[PDB]
């Protein structure tokens, strides 16, 4: 399998941007395989 990368842009903060989404406050656990779960 050919797994390869392709450039997709510069990393820059965008001034005056759409602010969106909420800000949830969650209780979570992280297991040794990298999975997060709700507690």
């Amino acid at each position: 399998v050919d797994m390869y990368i392709e450039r997709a842009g510069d990393i820059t903060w965008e001034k005056d941007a759409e602010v969106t989404g909420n800000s949830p406050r969650l209780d979570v656990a992280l297991d040794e395989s990298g999975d997060f779960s709700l507690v």
């Binding site: 510069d10 602010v19 990298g34």
Partner: protein, 155 residues
């Protein structure tokens, strides 16, 4: 020039078309992505090969060519931007105020933004443009929407 700074798509191909499986950040000669994007395997960059150097399945992170370089931290207060690079779509900046993953080992910033699986590894930015973590390891809440940790490695 196979490691010029920037954000990159991570693609796979076999005998037919390509699939975007994730995204990552090239900084200071090192490629940074999430472990579940590459399963820690080597990457091609043009005619060159990037070998895995550091990683951790619990953090769901991997770096290529050298140690993890991204060290900026969410300040716990300010809005951030997801530089989302979804499959088949141009990179776009999305501004949001993170919520919080509260864990037994401390709090982690978390962003409530939903994108296709292949957007995994897209960088999250502070107002200085520094990468404060990568998007794509998270949870699904009751209504089916998504919350991603702001996953950052140790430099």
């Amino acid at each position: 020039g196979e490691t010029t700074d920037g954000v990159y798509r991570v693609m796979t191909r076999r005998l037919l078309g390509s699939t975007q499986v994730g995204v990552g950040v090239m900084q200071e000669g090192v490629f940074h992505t999430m472990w579940h994007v590459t399963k820690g395997a080597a990457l091609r960059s043009g005619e060159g090969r990037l070998d895995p150097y550091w990683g951790d399945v619990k953090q769901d992170l991997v770096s290529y060519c050298g140690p993890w370089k991204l060290d900026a931290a969410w300040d716990g207060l300010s809005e951030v931007q997801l530089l989302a690079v979804p499959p088949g779509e141009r990179a776009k900046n999305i501004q949001t105020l993170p919520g919080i993953f509260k864990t037994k080992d401390g709090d982690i910033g978390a962003v409530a933004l939903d994108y296709p699986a292949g957007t995994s590894g897209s960088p999250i930015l502070d107002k200085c443009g520094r990468v404060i973590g990568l998007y794509g390891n998270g949870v699904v809440i009751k209504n089916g929407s998504y919350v991603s940790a702001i996953t950052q490695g140790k430099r």
